[PDB]
Amino acid sequence: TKKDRVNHCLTICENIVAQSVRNSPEFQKLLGIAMELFLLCSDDAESDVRMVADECLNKVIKALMDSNLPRLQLELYKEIKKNGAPRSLRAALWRFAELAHLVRPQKCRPYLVNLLPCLTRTSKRPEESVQETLAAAVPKIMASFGNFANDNEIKVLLKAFIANLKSSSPTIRRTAAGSAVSICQHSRRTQYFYSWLLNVLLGLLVPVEDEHSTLLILGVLLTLRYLVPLLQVSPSAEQLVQVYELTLHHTQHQDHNVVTGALELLQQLFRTPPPELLQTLTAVGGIGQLTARIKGDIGQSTDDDSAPLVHCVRLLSASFLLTGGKNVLVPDRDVRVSVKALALSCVGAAVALHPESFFSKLYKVPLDTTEYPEEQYVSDILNYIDHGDPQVRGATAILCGTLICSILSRSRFHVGDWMGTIRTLTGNTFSLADCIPLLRKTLKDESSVTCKLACTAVRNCVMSLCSSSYSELGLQLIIDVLTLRNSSYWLVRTELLETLAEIDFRLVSFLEAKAENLHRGAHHYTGLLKLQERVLNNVVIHLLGDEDPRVRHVAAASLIRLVPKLFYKCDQGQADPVVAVARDQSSVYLKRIYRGYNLLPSITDVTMENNLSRVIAAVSHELITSTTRALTFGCCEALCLLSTAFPVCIWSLGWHCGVPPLCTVGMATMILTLLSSAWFPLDLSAHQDALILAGNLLAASAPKSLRVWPALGDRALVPMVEQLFSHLLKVINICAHVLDDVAPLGSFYHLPSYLRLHDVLKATHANYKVTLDLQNSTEKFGGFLRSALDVLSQILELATLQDIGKCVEEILGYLKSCFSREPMMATVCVQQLLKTLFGTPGLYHYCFMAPYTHFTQALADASLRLFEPLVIKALKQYTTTTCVQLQKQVLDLLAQLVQLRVNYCLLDSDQVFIGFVLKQFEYIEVGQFRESEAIIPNIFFFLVLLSYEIGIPKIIQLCDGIMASGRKAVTHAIPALQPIVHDLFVLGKELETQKEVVVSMLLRLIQYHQVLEMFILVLQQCHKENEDKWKRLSRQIADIILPMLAKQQMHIDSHEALGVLNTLFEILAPSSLRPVDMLLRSMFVTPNTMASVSTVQLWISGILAILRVLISQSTEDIVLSRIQELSFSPYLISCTVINRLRDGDKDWYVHLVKSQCWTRSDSALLEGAELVNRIPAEDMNAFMMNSEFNLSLLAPCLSLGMSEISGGQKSALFEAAREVTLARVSGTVQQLPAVHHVFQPELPAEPAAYWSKLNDLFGDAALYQSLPTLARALAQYLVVVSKLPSHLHLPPEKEKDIVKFVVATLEALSWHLIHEQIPLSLDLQAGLDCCCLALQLPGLWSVVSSTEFVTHACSLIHCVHFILEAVAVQPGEQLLSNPKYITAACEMVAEMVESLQSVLALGHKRNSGVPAFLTPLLRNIIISLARLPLVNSYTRVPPLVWKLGWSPKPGGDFGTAFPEIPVEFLQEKEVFKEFIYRINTLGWTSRTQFEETWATLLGVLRTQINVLAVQAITSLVLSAMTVPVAGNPAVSCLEQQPRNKPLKALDTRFGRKLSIIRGIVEQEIQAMVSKRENIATHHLYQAWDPVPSLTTGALISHEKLLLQINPERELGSMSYKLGQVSIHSVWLGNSITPGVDIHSCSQFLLELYSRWILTPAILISEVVRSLLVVSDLFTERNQFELMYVTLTELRRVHPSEDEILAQYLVPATCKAAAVLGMDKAVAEPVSRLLESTLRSSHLPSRVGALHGVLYVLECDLLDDTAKQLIPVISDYLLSNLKGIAHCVNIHSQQHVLVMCATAFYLIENYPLDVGPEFSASIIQMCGVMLSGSEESTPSIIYHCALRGLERLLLSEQLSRLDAESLVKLSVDRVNVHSPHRAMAALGLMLTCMYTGESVIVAMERVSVLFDRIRKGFPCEARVVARILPQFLDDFFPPQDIMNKVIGEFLSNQQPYPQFMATVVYKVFQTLHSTGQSSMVRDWVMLSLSNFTQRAPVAMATWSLSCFFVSASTSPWVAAILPHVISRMGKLEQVDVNLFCLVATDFYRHQ
């Protein structure tokens, strides 16, 4: 039945696994019985039976390590106690060590007690096969069952194994020695049990002159080779020196098995020495202080005057390998060559310890000069290079390696001076010139065992020579190893490349330039000796192409060690090779997204990015141009080890090659073509390294690309991500059908390419399930399944819900089968899916000048649910596993189900999982837990985050147990509080008591430098919360740590440790460091003893970190006054004190213009200003600056010379009249007295007789007349400053005298109201315009603020409160219902700002008293005076505070410098509504005052005050959004962006003519039609639109954005109206396309408004509205993605019928999807929400939903199916215009205005997506509305639908029949009566003629312009006379233009020819072109006949003189016409003489 016995064992195995039913009361009985029967199959003796049925028992265990582990391990302990056959007991003992680390620590302590009776019987067994496997289980069992035993159980077990050293078998001697030493690593006390094994063994060799049973001598020396590796009460320093004398007697005790036993013990105690033993041998006296074949006086190891390591080399040589007479070999007959091999390796490991031994004499007393001629030294050790075999010539190859390694490190590379001292002491002649040619020879040796040992000698020896004086010989040994690259022994080639990885090839390139003979060398070569390109192209990349899997892996790790060490020539950092070595030695001595990628700005070394881009150039070249299988295969393994040490996201400029050509996608296009071949994935050793490297190269595009697969946003990048996500779902599809035996989107059935991949994952899985070996790193399926769930993770971050929404079904099925094999990184696949299913330089720079200036810059700053089946399975694993890499990834999966609020239903009835985390705190304190270190930071993050739903009272009692009762702090106690402190201090009366508890615990723990990072968090919140509490706490830790720094209790051993303590004294409050009594007693101290470098090192770190305080925090003056009092003697550490511690008509024209200028006053001002122009311009000041020039001819002289500059050439009008204006300003202030006193209208003469001078030099009625004529002068000059060149700005020296003159003209205004009357009340208006502009300029406003002008800034407050009170405040009222004058100026400004609510608001019931031309002027001037630093601190205090008890002292070197208001007053609503008024209309100042108001509002964040402070945070960001000064509502207003592009119809030669004509028409509209929100003053051409340029730039003027402004807005009215930042302007300031840190304030607001949504229904509505306004200021594609996620989870939860909340979120959700891609997963949620709200009955809900149409329709090329839902929005627009065609007054205003603005945006940009019938019918609905009456359709509805009609014509989109419908409607509206209505209709008549019988139809349009002169107001017909000169010259020739003008000039129905006189003048002088200047003459003849039929006789002669002027000579007749048309009637004798002169120069002109 021998073949019948085989079939029985194998059928029992398969019917247990295929049950699929475990933990059953039927299944429990079956597994016990037939489990003992698997080993009787092995107990039966046949190799056909023994081999077959032992691999079958391993199929049961591994399929049941998850399910039934406690049932498996109970049957198995029974068999050892049975103590069966030596074949039966053996193969069960393999099984029980591998399942020892699978037990739980709950059940472990019963398993320990039962084994020690069972583990002693198998130690007493003499079977030599049973004893072997126990030395491979007592390593594994007692390391996991180690910690659970006391001191009683482990002393019994070690007395047994020593009685197994008393046996004679060589197999049984070495298994009892490795059992004693594996326990003491894990016993209970690792250091206590090392000292106990050394006492037991030396009594077995107590005094050595005995008979010691020479088998038992070998038992004691083998337990000591295993324990000396572990020695590095304690094992004492006198216990270890008894070990060492024991062996030197036993290197002499004769045997060949006992001589070889004490020579392996000596080779290992020098390599890894115990540090107590190591100092007693190098010391000079050595053993003499601890006590208080050879034929000469050696001198034993007790003697002084020589080290014992000088002694120990004399002894091992003359007995083994040297004869004391002559340089001669010892024969191999005497000493074996196994015994001569271990004696050459012990002489080499001591020279690395004590190098002076090798130069010593062999005998101390010389040996018999009669017999021997000469005595020799120990240099005949180096004659064993010629001795025979390997490992003697190879172990004298390694004796010359560490003799050169350890002279250079002994004497610091001084091989000159150190060799002199020895030669006069021991007279040998042995230089290092006689050993390197002994080392150059063994590299060339024959045997491949001799070559392995000579190339480890160059690992030690060529980093010490090459930087030494012998670096001529040091470079040659670099050369010879390069010839050893092609020898055919696989261990010879991998110890080459480690001595080519430790090379510093920046120090190696330096020696090449110095060489001249070494480049030649042998055979006289010519050229360069290129080491670097030959050692990198022809070894390291070349040895990647080797055949062995051993040689390919070691060559990758060198390119991790070579890249920081290259030095390629001529970088833009290091230039020379001299400067290269200097930068690697100055950094040494002078100082949650997934793991793949990065979003930082990524500061990087510029020259370290250059060495990493030359090693990825030659590596992608032996992967593409390679011809072998072996070059492609082991160079995908060298690219996966770069990207885990030099990641791609950090070093992207090195990895970049090509793709996106600029954050990179480097080289990832080749490697996908390797994987898609059917050749390369068929072997799992390097297909798993090509998947970890293709996920690093598609993730470095994540900081660029992100704004199918809609989040990729780069269509050249999508096929690289479509492929891997197709490649990684077909490799989790072949790992699902393999772990479960099932026959063969992700699908590999129909591919024949991936049916080859199913036979390769099934060969590596038949060797795991058959061979039980749990602890393997390399498994190639367990290594391969780790690689393809790591990179399925990193792609899902790029994915969205819309791409994965068809695959959440797919990826969850595979992981339930992929869970059991590797659950550690199968939840890292599950941790990420839930994120994206829920949305989420020249050697003076380097050595000194670059590190010297990081020093001084930080000192000035020191002066300052398908988861429900998968989620339940992961919780059963944590209770039953034991590997603590898996316990760490399960505590992060549950901190994400509580943030993303999954309800606490994972434990539906009980509290099963939370009860198990409390028990694990029992095993850490006692220490019955194996790897608590890697779980204790993540245990405590799970616990604190649940309590916001175990409470924070209970959480902090658990952490107090670990610290005082448990292990050390730097693993357990200090990472325990990093989750608590960050989640308690950063994020009422219950919260105050728990903060006192946590600060007391750290004071017990200050000693550690990781505890000092937690305490920089504590000090930065008290400076923010409460500055009274901030200074109390920095005093308590002042007198703790400075007593520690003198007694050196502070662990500052690291340079991670000195960096934490110096950022502490900056942030510690300077009041606690201001007495220098404490810092000096902690400074000038002496430590206890400076013998040890543990204690020398902590005393010099206390002196370096309290000296960073005496340099910054206190200057030189304070420090040295103290030491005169404190007797700190300079003999503190002196050379006597430091020693005991270490041991212990040219001129005719000039006269005519004088008649109206040198006069008193005239009305000729616009006519007077033109005559001064053509004065010959070389002389203005001679003809303007005179005795009496009219100063009312000087201020309108400034306005006309600006219009020349705004278009063209520089103006002689405007340049020379800036010189005249500012000279008269100075002399009146020179007429003012010297020292100014403040004006006081209440008590004027009571101060002094200063006011006596002020009425005679200033109070003259002749000097008063100038002050309103000099007051119009400075009004027009300060306006144009925003648009003048730099020649024309006001001078800096004349800047003081324009500040002093605003003060002096506003005090002449207050001086008439007292005495005479009002000044003139136009002179009320001219004097307060000089004052409104000096407060808007950045130059003039700064001078008013300084200390010199306290009198001049408090006198504009007394005199603007005197003009506002003497006009508005009727007698017997008020406005609303230090020296004295400063606080009488400070109380004055508080009263005026409360009036802007009531008094000065434009149109209030209280505003009937102010005459409403000052409510523009006096509203802008009360704002800019309370921005002064004299005043501003008091004005922000609301008036309910001063009734309460708040009055601190002011000091700022001024009057009032009050601190800001504390939070406790703001907790009342009436007190809180008045503080928010003072901050918006007032703005802010320099940027320090912006962050003061930010901290006061957040502490407010009872629900009546939660509502009103979310609205206060909206208004603070917008004053950082303003385009000028940004924080001043006086000057400026909010920036807006046109969503209409600039036009195409301009920029042609006919098109540049289009832009001049409609410049004149639009500009006098805004003087009539518009609202002046921007403009305070009364001046005319104030056209100012704050559209910026865009990274912002200059400001765009109003004439350049001619038709940019959107039709949603009233003319010029600047406010928020939902369209401020259009998504055109998001993408080109923040480059994303699918002074305040304003970026800082917008990240903090995304965290706050999501936790309130995910609050009462009052607070639901006002939180969605604050987030839509700040959306102007989101500056990143990371920031727009978080906005869209929070708004969609609301709608499914919050009810649909909340129609306040419904109309803020439809504007909110739609502006996200525009900056985001409007993709197929985004369109279907965004398109459905716009359709429903337009059906709502709530009329302001209709209006917010229509702005969301625009942003979707605006920029993104919209999806083709979703643009068929534009006929959803097209149909709504037709229905509500036919009802609001006739009547607009009835229905609405801003529902009628916003709805016609989006009709115009469809016809231009998106024509074809709507019908052609829809375009022509929006034209017709603006006929009925624009031809309505002046009350049927309002003026605001009129002007906005009409500006959009001339937009569509300039766009070239409209048809030829569609365009002429607009032509007819514009004719009928010019003849309506209202001219502001009729000024806009004239602009439409131009554009139709400017987009286009030809002679005939143009006759009708021209005569429409001529009638508006006749009928029409003179505010209208100024516009018509500027155009019609320029208008007629362009269209039709001047023979036809001439007939209509004069016949409509001479007519009796001409109401005034005055404005018709300017029309005829500009025609002729363009007709004075050379072709038509004579045709000018013919038309003069016909018009003279018409005058003979007469007008009235005074009137008829006036028209004659105007005509001949316009047709005359050039220089002087042409300038007479404004002097002629000045006097129209009123004939004079002076009038008769002027007619004669003009028409006679024409008689000589013919």
Swiss-Prot record:
**Keyword set, alphabetical order:** Acetylation, Apoptosis, Cytoplasm, Cytoplasmic vesicle, Disease variant, Endosome, Intellectual disability, Lipoprotein, Myristate, Neurodegeneration, Nucleus, Phosphoprotein, Repeat, Ubl conjugation
**Outcome after substituting T778M:** Found in a patient with Rett syndrome-like phenotype; uncertain significance
Q: HEAT repeats at which positions? A: 110-147, 152-189, 430-467, 530-568
Q: Where is this motif: Nuclear export signal?
A: 1421-1430
Query: Which tissues is this chain's protein expressed in?
Result: Expressed in the brain cortex (at protein level). Widely expressed with the highest level of expression in the brain (nerve fibers, varicosities, and nerve endings). In the brain, the regions where it can be mainly found are the cerebellar cortex, the neocortex, the striatum, and the hippocampal formation.
- MF terms per GO, please? beta-tubulin binding; dynactin binding; dynein intermediate chain binding; heat shock protein binding; identical protein binding; kinase binding; p53 binding; phosphoprotein phosphatase activity
Any one GO BP annotation for this protein: positive regulation of lipophagy
**Could you tell me which residues carry N6-acetyllysine?**
K82, K140
- Could you state one GO cellular component term attached to this entry? presynaptic cytosol
- Record's domain comment? The N-terminal Gln-rich and Pro-rich domain has great conformational flexibility and is likely to exist in a fluctuating equilibrium of alpha-helical, random coil, and extended conformations.
The annotated subunit structure for this chain is: Interacts with PFN1. Interacts through its N-terminus with PRPF40A. Interacts with PQBP1. Interacts with SETD2. Interacts with SH3GLB1. Interacts with SYVN. Interacts with TPR; the interaction is inhibited by forms of Huntingtin with expanded polyglutamine stretch. Interacts with ZDHHC13 (via ANK repeats). Interacts with ZDHHC17 (via ANK repeats). Interacts with F8A1/F8A2/F8A3. Found in a complex with F8A1/F8A2/F8A3, HTT and RAB5A; mediates the recruitment of HTT by RAB5A.
Q: Which disease is it linked to?
A: Huntington disease: A neurodegenerative disorder characterized by involuntary movements (chorea), general motor impairment, psychiatric disorders and dementia. Onset of the disease occurs usually in the third or fourth decade of life. Onset and clinical course depend on the degree of poly-Gln repeat expansion, longer expansions resulting in earlier onset and more severe clinical manifestations. Neuropathology of Huntington disease displays a distinctive pattern with loss of neurons, especially in the caudate and putamen. Lopes-Maciel-Rodan syndrome: An autosomal recessive neurodevelopmental disorder characterized by developmental regression in infancy, delayed psychomotor development, severe intellectual disability, and cerebral and cerebellar atrophy. Additional features include swallowing problems, dystonia, bradykinesia, and continuous manual stereotypies without chorea. Some patients manifest seizures.
In terms of PANTHER family, this protein maps to: HUNTINGTIN, HUNTINGTON DISEASE PROTEIN
Stated family:
Belongs to the huntingtin family.
**Identification of the protein by name:** Huntingtin
* Annotated source species: Homo sapiens
Name of the gene encoding the protein in the UniProt record? HTT
